[PDB]
Amino acid sequence: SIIKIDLESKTPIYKQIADQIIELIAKGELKPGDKLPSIRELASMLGVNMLTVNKAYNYLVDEGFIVVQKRRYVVKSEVWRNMLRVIIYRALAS
Amino acid sequence: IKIDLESKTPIYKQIADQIIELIAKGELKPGDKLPSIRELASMLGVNMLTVNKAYNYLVDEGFIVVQKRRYVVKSEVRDESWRNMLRVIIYRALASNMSKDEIVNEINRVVSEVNS
């Protein structure tokens, strides 16, 4: 009920998981250092296969919002503009 | 586009960020098209598995879109996909210890900037 899986959105499930984990980090409901649920504990929480959560947790690792602390997932601690620049550009070019 | 083989950043992420740079820096732009998965996988010395992933990373982020069998810089605005990307921008901003006063102060600074 914290992470809403939107089954008819066209955002892939793993990406809605990741997006919402970022929102929760943004909202501060997940402070830094906060260990995350297991891949298995979160999949079952959501009704989802571990693979989709795996993909979600890895997306968050490459993007730099969580980190692995000997095989457990933890919110990191530090430091999207190019994203803005491309949509203004896409905006004004209309 | 150059692949730093020794960096800890993943290859697909390297490719993606560099292309995003081109889209952002105007050097790549709405309606433009990108090399085939294989053309790029052959320009670079990289197998097509991680090139495919790079492209599908740009698709999910919202940057490009398959049009015929072609990966194409997104041109379409006013839709809901437009609005999602914004939310991601402010959401990722807030999640990097930025004020809300801060972020939108800096949003205006980039809109004005490129109306060049």
Residue numbers in the entry:
A (entry chain A): 3 to 81, 85 to 99
B (entry chain B): 5 to 120
The authors write:
The thermoacidophilic model crenarchaeote Sulfolobus acidocaldarius is predicted to harbor a gene encoding a putative GntR-type TF belonging to the YtrA subfamily. Closer inspection of the amino acid sequence encoded by the concerned gene (Saci_1851) learned that the C-terminal E-O domain of this 121-amino acid protein consists of about 50 amino acids predicted to fold into two α-helices, thus classifying it as a member of the YtrA subfamily. YtrASa performs an (auto-)repression function by interacting with high specificity and affinity with a 32-bp long inverted repeat.
The 14-kDa YtrASa protein crystallized as a dimer with the asymmetric unit of the crystal structure containing a homodimer with an exclusive α-helical structure. Each monomeric unit displays an N-terminal DNA-binding domain harboring the typical GntR-like wHTH motif (α1–α3) and a short C-terminal E-O domain, consisting of two α helices (α4–α5) that mediate dimerization, which is a typical feature for YtrA-like regulators. The distance between the two monomeric Arg42 residues, located in wHTH domain, amounts 36 Å, which is similar to the length of one turn of the DNA helix. Furthermore, the alignment of individual monomeric chains from within the same dimer demonstrated that the E-O domain has an asymmetric nature. Although these observations might be ascribed to the crystal packing and are not necessarily biologically relevant, the short length of α4 underlies a compact E-O domain regardless of its exact conformation and a shorter distance between the two monomeric DNA-binding domains in comparison to other YtrA-like regulators.
